[PDB]
Each structure stands twice: as structure tokens, then as C-alpha cells.
């Protein structure tokens, strides 16, 4: 929240990062907004600290590099991390692969739905598939 | 419906012969694969795999291609440590994919059943991209913000959709 409130929240998050299942939850919660904000000196320091904590689930940092705020990282570095700049940055094969895969999944699911609609048009029986509506 | 909308659109001995010949070729190729300890036989196996792909280049004989049980041999070949031969076999499978989907679905599904390696998950993803080169996945992007999902989630989604497509074809 506010700089002081967000500072206390960042302190709590950094402390609780010591869990072995901290990523078992939806850990990819606000990483994108965090990169967007990554500011106040406390805010920039906390964003760098969270990134460095995430530097160790390598694919999670890979998703972070797919977010790809390297330009903002350079600007924030010039305003006053390095390990993430070495590892996460300059590894984008993952990025193109995962982008293409996500788009492909969307397209395939849509095509399946439309096909089922047409098939039920043929048969005339009403459509009944779980969670479809 | 074809008669009403588009009526105009409406020698297999050699096909079946080539299917049996490819069966013998796959037998010899597996013989070389068991002998894949010398690079001469490895090169011969690569040539045999090229021949197998050329055989796979046919359209309608997919029924025979699966009937000869080539799928399991190909799967074993994918588990071979021959990297160039692995890539070639992947290209051959991709060329097979356009003919039918169920073969691809079963192939990758069996390929899964082997905290797996990030390289292994990468291999699965690369094979799935080769598959997704299909026209069914060929479509337009939304031109809108498609949020990025995590990796293990991507594995789960890929497995789910693969089984889905398999079964959906299977109902026919």
C-alpha cells in the first residue's frame, strides 16, 4: 500500500520468503505490478530485494525475465539485481516458446468449443458439459 | 450435404507393400539402435530414419503406419541418446502430424509417462510446438493482453489438452 504500509508488507514478505512452499501458493501474484513500480528509495530497494529473493524455482525467474523489465532495471540501477541481470536476462528461448504455447492453447480450446457446438446442432440433444457455461 | 453444397470434391497394393517394407526397415533400424555403439551403424540408422520419414511423407496410409506399430519404435527412438537422430525423428513425426492428430496425441502421451528435468519438460514443449504447427492451432492472436502463466502450469495445461484431443478424436 502506502510507502510505510507497503514497507511493512515488504518486510513481512521478505521474512516469510523462508518457506519451502512459499511458491506452492499463487506466488505469481503481483510480480508484474512489482516490475511496473520498480520510485521511493524504500520501494526500489524492496523491489530489488524481492527480485534477488526470487533469483533462486529457476523457471519462476525465467517467467520474470519473460516479463522483461530490463530497461526499467537499467534505469533504476543508474538511479543509484546484478545476479538476476546475468541469469534471467539474455535467456529468452523460454520466452518465445512459452508465449507461443499459451496462444496455441487458447486457440485450440476455442476451436474445440465451437466444434462441439456444431456437433450438438447436428444431433439436437442439448449441450451438457461441466463448467462449460 | 456434399451433393448439395459441393459435389465435385467427392492401387493401394503398393501402399501396403511400402508399409510392410517400412516395417522391415524399422526392424533393421531398431537392430541398428541396439547396435548404436559405433558411429558407422549410427549413420546408417540416420539414413534409415530419413527413409522412414520419406515413407511417412504419404497422406492416406497413416492407418498402416500405426498398424505396423511404428509408434512404440519411434518413441523408443526419441529416448535414444542420438541428438541429431532425435531431431530428425521429431521432424518425421511433425510431418506425420498433418495426416492425423490421434497419432500425435498418443505419441506424446506415452512420451510423458517416462519433478522431471527442465530439459525434459523443454523437450516435451518443443515437441508440442512442432505439433502446434498444425492448422488446428493455426489461428489469429487476440491482439489483446494474454497474461503469462507459469511453467509447471504450462505442463499441466499441455497434458490436459493432449488427453482431451486424443479422446475427442477417439470418439469417432
From Swiss-Prot, chain A:
It comes from the Eukaryota. Neddylated. Neddylation is mediated by E1 enzyme UBA3-NAE1 complex and E2 enzyme UBE2F. Structural rearrangment of the C-terminal TRIAD/RBR supradomain may play a role in neddylation and deneddylation. Ubiquitously expressed in all tissues with highest expression in testis brain and kidney. Signal peptide: none annotated. It is found in: Cytoplasm. Belongs to the cullin family. Component of the Cul9-RING complex consisting of CUL9 and RBX1; the CUL9-RBX1 complex is a heterododecamer composed of six CUL9 and six RBX1 protomers. Interacts (via C-terminal TRIAD/RBR supradomain) with E2 ubiquitin-conjugating enzyme UBE2L3. Interacts with CUL7; the interaction with the CUL7 component of the 3M complex leads to inhibition of CUL9 activity. The CUL7-CUL9 heterodimer seems to interact specifically with TP53, likely via the CPH domain. Forms a complex with p53/TP53 in the cytoplasm of unstressed cells. Interacts with UBCH7 and UBCH8. Core component of a Cul9-RING ubiquitin-protein ligase complex composed of CUL9 and RBX1. The CUL9-RBX1 complex mediates ubiquitination and subsequent degradation of BIRC5 and is required to maintain microtubule dynamics and genome integrity. Acts downstream of the 3M complex, which inhibits the ubiquitination of BIRC5. The CUL9-RBX1 complex also mediates mono-ubiquitination of p53/TP53. Acts as a cytoplasmic anchor protein in p53/TP53-associated protein complex. Regulates the subcellular localization of p53/TP53 and its subsequent function. The C-terminal TRIAD/RBR supradomain is essential for ubiquitination activity. The IBR domain is required for interaction with UBCH7 and UBCH8. This is Cullin-9.
Amino acid at each position: 500500500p502506502n510507502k510505510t504500509l507497503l514497507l511493512s508488507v515488504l518486510r513481512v514478505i521478505t521474512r516469510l520468503l523462508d518457506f519451502p512452499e512459499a511458491m506452492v501458493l499463487p506466488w505469481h501474484e503481483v510480480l508484474e505490478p512489482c516490475l511496473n513500480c520498480l520510485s521511493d528509495s524504500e520501494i526500489v530497494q524492496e523491489l530489488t530485494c524481492f527480485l534477488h529473493r526470487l533469483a533462486s524455482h529457476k523457471d519462476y525467474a525465467v517467467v520474470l525475465c519473460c516479463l522483461g523489465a530490463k530497461e526499467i532495471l537499467s534505469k533504476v540501477l543508474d538511479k543509484h539485481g546484478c545476479e538476476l541481470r546475468d541469469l534471467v536476462t539474455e535467456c529468452e528461448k523460454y520466452a518465445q516458446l512459452y508465449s507461443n504455447l499459451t496462444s496455441s492453447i487458447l486457440a485450440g480450446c476455442i476451436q474445440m468449443v465451437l466444434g462441439q457446438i456444431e456437433d450438438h446442432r447436428r444431433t439436437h440433444q442439448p449441450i451438457n458439459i461441466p463448467f462449460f457455461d | 450435404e456434399v451433393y448439395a453444397n459441393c459435389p465435385g470434391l467427392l492401387d493401394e497394393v503398393a501402399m501396403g507393400e511400402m508399409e510392410a517394407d517400412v516395417q522391415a526397415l524399422v526392424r533393421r533400424a531398431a537392430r541398428q539402435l541396439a547396435e548404436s555403439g559405433t558411429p558407422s551403424l549410427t549413420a546408417a540408422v540416420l539414413h534409415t530414419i530419413h527413409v522412414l520419414s520419406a515413407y511417412a511423407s504419404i497422406g492416406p496410409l497413416t492407418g498402416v503406419f500405426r498398424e505396423t506399430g511404428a509408434l512404440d519404435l519411434l518413441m523408443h527412438m526419441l529416448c535414444n541418446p542420438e541428438p541429431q537422430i532425435r531431431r530428425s525423428a521429431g521432424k518425421m513425426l511433425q510431418a506425420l502430424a498433418a495426416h492425423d492428430a490421434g497419432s500425435r496425441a498418443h505419441v506424446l502421451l506415452s512420451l510423458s509417462q517416462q519433478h522431471m528435468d527442465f530439459d525434459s519438460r523443454y523437450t516435451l514443449l518443443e515437441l508440442f510446438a512442432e505439433t502446434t504447427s498444425s492448422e488446428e492451432h493455426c489461428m489469429a492472436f487476440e491482439g489483446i493482453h494474454l497474461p503469462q502463466i507459469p511453467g509447471k502450469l504450462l505442463f499441466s495445461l499441455v497434458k490436459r489438452y493432449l488427453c482431451v484431443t486424443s479422446l475427442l478424436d477417439q470418439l469417432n
